[PDB]
Amino acid sequence: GDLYVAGCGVWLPPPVTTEQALAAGHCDRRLASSTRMLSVAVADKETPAEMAALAAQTALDRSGVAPAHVDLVLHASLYFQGHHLWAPSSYVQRVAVGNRCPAMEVRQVSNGGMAALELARAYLLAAPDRVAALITTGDRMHPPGFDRWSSDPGTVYADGGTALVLSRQGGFARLRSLVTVSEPVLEGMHRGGHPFGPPSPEEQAVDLDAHKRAYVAEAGSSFSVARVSAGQEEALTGALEAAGAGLDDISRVVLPHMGWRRLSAAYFNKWHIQPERTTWEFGRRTGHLGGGDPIAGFDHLVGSGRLAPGELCLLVSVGAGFSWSCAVVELLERPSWAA
C-alpha cells in the first residue's frame, strides 16, 4: 500500500542576517523590504555532498533503518556539485549509508527533492522486497558563479543539505499523495536563446531575471502568468483529491522559501491562507535550499511539534521548467527526536 516517512533531517550552516548582508553591500534596502528575509544559511568550507551526507546521517539515525534495507540513494541539487565527472551520490552513499545499492543524482531545479521522491516511490513500489530509499539535497551558492541575493531577485539562495528516508514498512508519517505537474512550454524562461528555439551557447555567472523578460516578450505576459497559475493549481488540486482532502483539512502548508512578494502573489493572496499556517517564519530565516525546501520545512514542522498526530501537512514545491509537486503528509505520531 502506501509509503511512510521514516526519517528526515537537515544540515544548515550558520545564518547570515539581512543586516549583515545590507552592511556588506550584498543586498539593498528595497530587496530587504520586498522579500522580508531575516537571515540565510551560508556555508564556509562545506561542499554540497558533504552537507547532504551530514543531513542523511541524521535522517538515517532517526529512521532506525539499517543500511541493508536502504535500496536506493537519490541525490538532488540545482547548482555545481564541486567536481566534474565525479559522483556526489556515491559520496553520500560511502559516508552516510555504506551499502551497495544504486546511487544516483536526480535534478529538476528547485523541484529536485520532490522529483527524487517521485522516483524513490516508484522504485520502492516496483518490486515487493524493497524497503527503504534515501533522498538528499545539497547546494553551495557562492561567488563567483552565483549571487545568492541577486542572481534571481525575490528569492535568496541558501547553502545546506536536507534528507528524507522513504519506507514501505513504516515510519512516523504517511505519504497520502504525491502529484507532479509539468508545463515544459515554459522552459525557455530560465535560459538564453529563443524561448521556442534552441538554447544559446553556455553561460556559467547566472542571471535569471533577463531570460524571464525575454520569454514574456515573445510568449506574452498574459499567457505566461496563466500557465504558471494553471500548473500550480493542477498540482495542489491533484494532491488534495488524491488524498481525500481539501485545503481546509490541512493544518500546515510547507511553502517554498521564496521572498514575501513571491509568496503573497503565488500563495497568500491566491489561496487566501494565513502565513502562520505556513513555514513562512522558518523560510525567511533559512533561505531557498535548492530542491530541498519541502524537506527542510516538513522536518522543521515535525521537529518543533507544530504538527500533531492525525493532522495533515501539504508540501508545496515548484521548479523552473516548469514542474510543480504537491504532497499530502499525515503525521501518525511524534518521533523520538521531536520536541
* Out of 107, 227, 262, 270, the residue judged to bind a copy of itself by CB under 8 A: 107
Asked if 182 is part of the footprint of a copy of itself (rule: CB under 8 A), the reply reads yes
Asked if 126 is part of the footprint of a copy of itself (rule: CB under 8 A), the reply reads yes
Alpha-carbon gap, residue 264 to 254, rounded angstroms? 14
Asked if 210 is part of the footprint of a copy of itself (rule: CB under 8 A), the reply reads no
In the complex with a copy of itself, the residue whose CB is nearer, 185 or 250, is: 185
Please tell me whether residue 45 adopts helix, strand or coil conformation.
coil
User: Per-residue b/e over 4-32, b at no fewer than 16 CB within 10 Å?
Assistant: bbbbbbbbbbebbebeebeeeebbeeebb
DSSP at 186: G
Beta strands 70-76 and 132-139, pairing class? parallel
CB under 8 A: which stretch of 2-10, 118-126, 221-229, 274-282 binds a copy of itself?
118-126
CB under 8 A: which stretch of 24-32, 185-193, 218-226, 235-243 binds a copy of itself?
185-193
Query: Which of 248, 255, 266 lies closest to 312 in space, CA to CA?
Result: 248
In the complex with a copy of itself, the residue whose CB is nearer, 79 or 260, is: 79
* Out of 29, 30, 100, 272, the residue judged to bind a copy of itself by CB under 8 A: 100
Query: In the complex, what is the shortest distance from the CB of residue 50 to a copy of itself, in angstroms, rounded to a whole number?
Result: 5
Alpha-carbon gap, residue 252 to 250, rounded angstroms? 6
Asked if 108 is part of the footprint of a copy of itself (rule: CB under 8 A), the reply reads yes
CB under 8 A: which stretch of 5-13, 23-31, 59-67, 94-102 binds a copy of itself?
94-102
Query: In the complex, what is the shortest distance from the CB of residue 40 to a copy of itself, in angstroms, rounded to a whole number?
Result: 17
**13-32: contacts with a copy of itself (CB under 8 A):** none
Question: Do 189 and 195 form a contact (C-beta atoms < 8 A)?
Answer: yes
- End-to-end, the C-alpha distance of the chain in Å comes to 30
Element (H, E) at 297: helix 293-303
Query: In the complex, what is the shortest distance from the CB of residue 149 to a copy of itself, in angstroms, rounded to a whole number?
Result: 14
Asked if 129 is part of the footprint of a copy of itself (rule: CB under 8 A), the reply reads no
Query: Which of 97, 85, 20, 19 lies closest to 57 in space, CA to CA?
Result: 97
Beta strands 160-167 and 132-139, pairing class? antiparallel
Please tell me whether residue 8 adopts helix, strand or coil conformation.
strand
**211-270: contacts with a copy of itself (CB under 8 A):** 211
Query: In the complex, what is the shortest distance from the CB of residue 31 to a copy of itself, in angstroms, rounded to a whole number?
Result: 18
Task: Answer positive or negative: Cα dihedral of 200, 204, 209, 210.
Answer: negative
**54-93: contacts with a copy of itself (CB under 8 A):** 78-80, 82-87, 89-91, 93
Asked if 40 is part of the footprint of a copy of itself (rule: CB under 8 A), the reply reads no
Asked if 109 is part of the footprint of a copy of itself (rule: CB under 8 A), the reply reads yes
In the complex with a copy of itself, the residue whose CB is nearer, 25 or 201, is: 201
